[PDB]
Design a protein around this ligand. Structure first.
Ligand code: LBV
Ligand code: LBV
Lengths: 475, 478
């Protein structure tokens, strides 16, 4: 449930309440440009940023209450045609203006209200890059080209590709940075660090920046909309003031400027091309457009490459599965055959541990909890219904196995025969990796993942239940 | 199975054998630009188009056997780095050159051989950005397609821009059109599998752009025609400048099309369709502008998928409401026949059908346009022969030979048995397909309708699924 903004008696945005901050309505913009609001039908200017007077070369009451018909005689008709009444806030029209200098007009309609962003403005890298992304072999190499290309175009100090995991937590899957900067490659950060409110907004509008992290915001006058005495939804405005709670996060990293392009796959915020500069840095509108193209070109290509990887992954697993089933038919001893490192039942499910259980007894393979602990676990496994069991934290699902986290935090089991006398049981180790900020957010991520293992890829869980069925036939 | 090309004693490309034409190897290019081939490792120039001598300002033996290291001193290193050995033919590098004028260098590697396309180069500003957002904020596939054809026409200034959508059976349809005032409309017309051969489809899935800048211009062969590396024909498949098939050039000339262009719309490794473009006079799109089309080609390739799947979602959502409104009256049922014949329920409109046979309580009724009295008896007698609860077809005339005569009233079929066995059953029926307005457009439209003899509109899978849901619901109405 949202809070009111700071300008409507709303509360302090602390670190404990920040998931409720109304970030779509700061009623203020960044000072590198200027903002007007106007009535959708009449084109009557209603609101205005304080600096807008100066950005344009007209006096602060002369602009207010004026028509866009008069102000933008050439643009106003074509503008209005480009944005129908009732069309979505996602739809943006851009044109350039020739003024006393060159200005980049960016427009979008939030129903009744038109919003107008002004910024100052004036070869084949993108085309070559598009083809590079397409002819990349896998998601990792795709991500590398993405971060690399974005850095070559912008000249940012750091360009990460931040990938969201199923549990809303993030990971830097790729990085392209300046020589002599500390690497975030591989680091992971919690759900908390990018709130749901921001995620949801980043799914609608696929670009936002923070041109200077220490610059003061420029409020709107009036702050509230004369139409509806309601706060002006700047959610889909580039110039929107960035959250002060997040600006602080960036300042504590020594980030002078920020930028992030949303990578959206099938109406789902898959990730961000996240960018940092160590000094303030305003990307030109003409160049940001290039990023937005990549943002969508990547949004396609992620999906194509990622699904093609998952395909080739399970294809490895079918071959591995069928090589087990080969030796499982020609079986001298059920335990001997599966313990065999040539078969590698650990490597099929990529596991730190494994319990083979057959003929009224059990063996281990690899790193596994102590002798009595396994007996307790196998005793517990019989309690479960169905042929297949699964978890990313057996410590939770089974409280008495909290102590067994280090050797076996994550679990994937299957019963060979029905009932758990004869069964295979994969086990994975507890996960581990290498005040406000990323030092703390990395630590607090690992704190969120206490007694948590790497989760099981669905292809592994499916192939497990295939192997479950195959090994019943080995009897 | 491919034929050899015309330059290796290969046969005449007739209209009956053309699905075998080796269109990836014409060993010739269009004269609006020039082409070099070079060795991948050494950069040694191997092949050359005849006009290349003149396009560059160097003599026809001076260029041959020369290094690219010498010829393109600044580009050759960056070029070579951009295209690794063993990288795919899809990957293209572009740069501009400053020569005695401006040239547009386009490069791609086919394994051992580098291929280099030269075109002359040097409006508009935010048209693409605005257009990208327009495509995104379009409400449906139809409106998306309209913005696409419209935008492409605004950028290029083509005489006609169609969006040609492939159907499941490889046949095409012009789902949208943006054309010049005073030109004959192809909007709605459909064309067979034959008119875009499998060889071309497959090539158009790999490389997402090809043109025909002048339909009556002569091709410019390569010298040597065969590759000095492997005495093998030079695979120009992924070259813009590749000579268009003469069999297709004839198709365009018989439409009065002077220039052509088409961008592939690929969805999930599948050739979904083409943004097809025509100009009535010859017209060479600038490289810098074609790039813009290629962006749209991919921006659309995403957006098609998003809009098309979101339409299919909202479609089946209509069908759940319709289904549940039937199941409402099916529980509160005075008479099984009376309730379903009711036009308020509209069992025709659920499956969008020209006919319907209601069969219950040892007898049958019709609704809408349906074959004669004895014909239905023969059909229902036949329906009992089929296994499973559900039956389906786009041509019952084929599946059931004795119902060939029944095509006009009922060419397409979707049936379901209420109880198990076909005593009690619902049977939707669709009319034979038809539409309104010796090689070209108006033969290919006629020959399409000839391919669709005794064929109805096919059943959308959402309709077939909802049919089998309704099948289960109406068993519970007993
Ligand atoms: C209690 C709330 C917190 C909070 C709020 C917050 N964060 C954002 C937006 C972003 N946060 C990002 C997080 C990271 N950037 C990094 O570089 C790394 C690690 C290497 C992390 C984890 C990112 C990338 C964004 C997007 C914007 C950008 O690229 O700068 C918002 C929304 C901002 C806006 O647009 O108005 C908010 C409200 N962040 C916290 O850490 C806690 C305190
Ligand atoms: C027996 C073989 C035939 C044949 C060969 C052929 N066709 C193409 C490429 C295209 N054919 C297209 C068909 C149409 N264009 C239209 O405007 C309409 C109707 C309104 C149709 C049905 C199209 C669009 C293409 C793509 C290229 C373009 O836009 O011009 C090829 C491949 C050409 C190449 O790139 O080398 C071939 C071999 N076409 C026939 O009709 C029969 C005779």
């Amino acid at each position: 449930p949202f809070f009111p903004p700071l300008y409507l008696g709303g509360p302090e945005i602390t670190t404990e309440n920040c998931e409720r901050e109304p970030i779509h309505i700061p009623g203020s913009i960044q000072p590198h440009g200027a903002l007007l609001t106007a009535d959708g039908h009449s084109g009557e200017v209603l609101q205005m940023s304080l600096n807008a007077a100066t950005f344009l070369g007209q006096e602060p009451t002369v602009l207010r209450g004026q028509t866009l018909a008069a102000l933008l005689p050439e643009q106003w008709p074509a503008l209005q045609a480009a944005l129908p009444p009732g069309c979505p806030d996602a739809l943006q029209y851009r044109a350039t203006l020739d003024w006393p200098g060159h200005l980049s007009l960016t427009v979008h309609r939030v129903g009744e209200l038109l919003i107008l962003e002004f910024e100052p403005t004036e070869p084949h890298a993108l085309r070559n890059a598009m083809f590079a992304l397409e002819s990349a072999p896998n998601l990792r190499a795709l991500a590398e080209v993405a971060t690399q290309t974005v850095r070559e175009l912008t000249g940012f100090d750091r360009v990460m590709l931040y990938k969201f995991a199923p549990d809303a937590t993030g990971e830097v899957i790729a990085e392209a940075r300046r020589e002599g900067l500390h690497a975030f490659l591989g680091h992971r950060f919690p759900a908390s660090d990018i709130p749901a409110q921001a995620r949801a907004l980043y799914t609608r509008h696929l670009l936002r920046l923070t041109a200077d992290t220490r610059a003061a915001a420029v409020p709107l006058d009036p702050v509230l909309n004369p139409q509806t005495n309601a706060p002006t939804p700047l959610g889909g405005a580039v110039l929107r003031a960035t959250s002060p709670m997040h600006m602080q996060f960036l300042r504590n990293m020594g980030v002078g400027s920020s930028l992030s392009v949303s990578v959206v796959v099938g109406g789902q915020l898959w990730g961000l091309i996240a960018c940092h500069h160590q000094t303030p840095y305003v990307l030109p509108p003409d160049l940001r457009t290039t990023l937005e193209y990549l943002g969508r070109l990547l949004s396609l290509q992620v999906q194509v490459k990622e699904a093609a990887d998952v395909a080739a992954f399970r294809q490895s697993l079918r071959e591995h599965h069928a090589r087990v089933a080969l030796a499982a038919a020609h079986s001298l001893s059920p335990h001997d055959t599966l313990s065999d490192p040539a078969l590698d039942l650990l490597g099929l499910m990529r596991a730190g541990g494994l319990i083979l259980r057959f003929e009224g007894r059990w063996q281990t393979l690899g790193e596994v909890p102590p002798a009595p602990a396994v007996d307790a676990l196998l005793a517990w496994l019989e309690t479960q219904p169905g042929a297949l069991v699964q978890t990313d934290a057996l410590g939770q699902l089974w409280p008495a196995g909290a102590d067994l986290a280090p050797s076996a935090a994550g679990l994937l089991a299957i019963s060979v025969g029905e009932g758990w006398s004869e069964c295979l049981v994969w086990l994975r180790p507890e996960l581990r990796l290498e005040d406000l900020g990323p030092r703390h957010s990395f630590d607090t991520y690992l704190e969120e993942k206490r007694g948590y293992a790497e989760p099981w890829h669905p292809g592994e869980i499916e192939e497990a239940q295939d192997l479950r069925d195959t090994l019943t036939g080995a009897l």
